[PDB]
Amino acid sequence: FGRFTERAQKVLALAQEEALRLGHNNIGTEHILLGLVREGEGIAAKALQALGLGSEKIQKEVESLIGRGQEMSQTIHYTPRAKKVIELSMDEARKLGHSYVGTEHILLGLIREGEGVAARVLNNLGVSLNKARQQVLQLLGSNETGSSAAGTNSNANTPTLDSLARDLTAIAKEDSLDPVIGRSKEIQRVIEVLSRRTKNNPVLIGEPGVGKTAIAEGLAQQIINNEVPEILRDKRVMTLDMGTVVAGTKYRGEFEDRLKKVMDEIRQAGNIILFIDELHTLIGAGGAEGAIDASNILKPSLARGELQCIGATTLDEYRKYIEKDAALERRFQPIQVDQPSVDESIQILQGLRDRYEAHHRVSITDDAIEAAVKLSDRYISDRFLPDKAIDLIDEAGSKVRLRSFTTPPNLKELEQKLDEVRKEKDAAVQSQEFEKAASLRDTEQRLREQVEDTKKSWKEKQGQENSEVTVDDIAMVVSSWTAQTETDKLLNMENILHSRVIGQDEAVVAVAKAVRRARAGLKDPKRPIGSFIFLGPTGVGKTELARALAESIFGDEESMIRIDMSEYMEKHSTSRLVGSPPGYVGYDEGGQLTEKVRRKPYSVVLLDAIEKAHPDVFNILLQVLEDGRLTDSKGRTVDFRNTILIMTSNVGASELKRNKYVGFNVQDETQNHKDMKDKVMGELKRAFRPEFINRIDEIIVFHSLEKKHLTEIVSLMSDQLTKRLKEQDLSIELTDAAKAKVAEEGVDLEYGARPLRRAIQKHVEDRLSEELLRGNIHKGQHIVLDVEDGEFVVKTTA
Amino acid sequence: FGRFTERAQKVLALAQEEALRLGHNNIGTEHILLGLVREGEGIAAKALQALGLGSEKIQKEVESLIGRGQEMSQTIHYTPRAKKVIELSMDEARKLGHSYVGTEHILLGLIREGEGVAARVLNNLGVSLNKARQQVLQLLGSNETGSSAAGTNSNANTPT
Amino acid sequence: QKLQFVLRFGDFEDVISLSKLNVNGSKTTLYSFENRYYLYVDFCNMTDEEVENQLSILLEYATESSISIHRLEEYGKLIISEHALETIKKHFAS
């Protein structure tokens, strides 16, 4: 595994030859030995020639142990013994120079896995098994490039460089390093800042968020070669790691004792570069606790230029050095950080796409990689633009290989049979049913060889997949969270939202399209997938649509937060002369609202009745609308460029409760409409800010169930009723006649599609239950709720 | 308890046979011993045959201890000693894994229950009580259910 | 070197495979034990080398269990005793 060296495969195939050449059904361990020595100067092969065991010497023994005469060579794959020798060698080659496994390991591994026919050959040919394993072993040497040492250099450097810790230069002189992809701009800014004297310390600020250590591989490279000022030559580079110091110790005092000592050995000054990761924790400055205050020693260490250092810090962290002085404000100095831009992001991916050939499902397609990135920024939507991507790539980077295990050639069906046989066979072998196990056995083994043959016909799913990530596939994985399972969601969004909300179909198509706009990409990636205000009677389709969006986009009905803003009113109720004040905006901003939406990072946030809130609430919402961020609790930016913010309202209430209503005529709809879409939208604005509405995408007006919205919402609820009782075996139906009568409760201007639950309860649950208890209707038999006189009548039907 | 293997019950019922066959009111340990060895080649039974204790050899001792002549076989349930041999065996089967308890455990349990008339038979017939408990044990190996040892692969996997 | 071994064969079809060209004057007894079929092979009057020889072939089709024969002798389960290969060639192949 991980792909092998030739030498292994070569000794192995020579085994298969000895199988048929000597007549063996399954290529035994006797052949593996012959195989090794017939590969001549393989480390295995060679070893045996030392041991005195030639191909001949071995074979003389071999023919006398099995040899003859299964030239038919029934099912010529290995013995399981021989297969074990291979599994062992592989790991013993991981152990002994070979990721890609070769000969050495195979004799070595053979000895370890020294059994049966193989083993007996060498102990008969006067060779101890470990004398052989020795022999392979003693033909090893260095294979780690940049290493095979025999030289000597330097002196004074000794005590310091030991301790503690990682050395980026070392691994880059053994060059296993991958550059990777810049994140370029920090690196120049360090060398000005680091060939200094009085202050000599760079401090990299922000973006953590790129894998900071990648930038470090930048630094490593430039501090060596070759544009550098004089004190930045005769330099040696040490990375300081918190982890090595803390390990093996408990109490804080021990860590400090070691740390004072380390800073002292750091006396190699003007010839030493120290990299200090997570610099803040040690400095400890300000706040209520900035963590372990190593700072007392560390600040002069930084200032002196003995512990001339490069600080890897963050947005807030800079405060906690510039606040201290003059050995943290004579140490710190800021430098401008970059990452590999959105297109660059894609390219990093591509570079290690091909390297999931230990995964063999991608290596490529490029367009799919491109999709991974581009789709991610709006489709969850809160991380860095390449990390998101790789999860898609790799997900999808199995997903089509998963489509294997059913139809595409589906020679899985073969295997499906082969199992079933074994069973029949097996149970027959247990009962006996001798020849009655026999033919089942034969049917089984028929299957087996055929299976094994088609299992390397299922190299075709490699030839299928290790191109293609599938663009669509990748898209599907982003959607799994958030083409394939996203564009049916996009294209049919109105239809999908319509299938859950019939409460205002007008509204559904509008909302559908707005989410679909952002979710198809053309909105700033600093704004939610939807801002809205929903005016209407309340609950018209309003709440329900928030639900339906969760339902349509995520494949989970609910992935939808929901807060009533009217409770954080501060608009007609805060405090009085000498009565205590509340906290309302502090509650939403300060933690509650923001924490909740952070849990499902993408979520339809439904802020009910926001017009009953003062203009101050809207500013916070405005940050979502602008930033696609909300700034809250413990300095987090929670990326609200994900979320679908949906705010409900009614403050022009009267017009929205004298709303569109086709049951009162068509011309009552568009003049209740026209009236509500201006006096409401201005009581809305008066209960908001125009500035609020200026970064809110759309104000949707919902109209109580016009004639025509109702009985279909009711026929879903009444049917939801009828469906939840069927699972436990009770058949109820409300006829269209009964679903109609239920729908009538909300025809009210004032109500939405919220009162509908009560009328399903009253007309279905309550009406049936007082009849199921009396035995007019029963279990499993069909219970028809019908209307036959303008009132319900429950009839029974088989 | 947890329900038993036949082998236990099988050695046991032969005691009851022996109850009447020599006349024992409540079926003594001497009858249990005969029960074990008359169950032939169960691990208890088999064991006794190794030490040289055949049903014959045993019975010769047995009739000369109690033997005669409670042929009335009053209530014919066990003697409390004989009931103990069973209580012990259950645990000697915990000992040699068997929720369903069988033969080895019963001879092993017998040794435990060395008070018995049975016990005295074997130490008279030149067989140490533990030479027998040994004997039952050494006719086992390992039952398992998927393991059986010998032959392995992989190396690098070790530290993790 | 023991001339009698207690062997485990996996799937039944393995016992058959062995059978169809081995018996070799050697009574062999076939258990099902741990649901996999064990064969306690008894090379009758074959030299140590001769036994390793014969036994090689057997272990082309199986591996040799550590398991002592007396675990089988008490708590085992037979499929064909003492003529195990021979019978299996008839009734399990064919």
Swiss-Prot record, chain A:
Gene Ontology molecular function: any one: ATP hydrolysis activity
Repeat 1: annotated segments: 4-69
Region (I): 161-408
Keyword Transcription: yes
GO biological process: establishment of competence for transformation
Annotated spans, Repeat 2: 78-142
All copies of domain UVR, residue ranges: 415-450
Pfam families reported in the protein's UniProt record: AAA, AAA_2, AAA_lid_9, Clp_N, ClpB_D2-small
Domain of life: Bacteria
Key words, A-Z: ATP-binding, Chaperone, Competence, Nucleotide-binding, Repeat, Repressor, Transcription, Transcription regulation
Annotated spans, II: 469-653
Family in the record: Belongs to the ClpA/ClpB family. ClpC subfamily.
Role description: Competence gene repressor; required for cell growth at high temperature. Negative regulator of comK expression. May interact with MecA to negatively regulate comK.
The protein, known as: Negative regulator of genetic competence ClpC/MecB
The encoding gene: clpC
From Swiss-Prot, chain C:
Disulfide bonds: none
Entry keyword set: Competence, Sporulation
MF-aspect GO terms: protein-macromolecule adaptor activity
Any single GO BP term: establishment of competence for transformation
Domain notes: The N-terminal domain has binding sites for ComK and ComS and probably for unfolded/aggregated proteins; the C-terminal domain interacts with ClpC.
Function: Enables the recognition and targeting of unfolded and aggregated proteins to the ClpC protease or to other proteins involved in proteolysis. Acts negatively in the development of competence by binding ComK and recruiting it to the ClpCP protease. When overexpressed, inhibits sporulation. Also involved in Spx degradation by ClpC.
Entry protein name: Adapter protein MecA 1
Species for this entry: Bacillus subtilis (strain 168)
Organism placement in taxonomy: Bacteria, Bacillati, Bacillota, Bacilli, Bacillales
Part of the full-length chain shown: 125 to 218 of 218
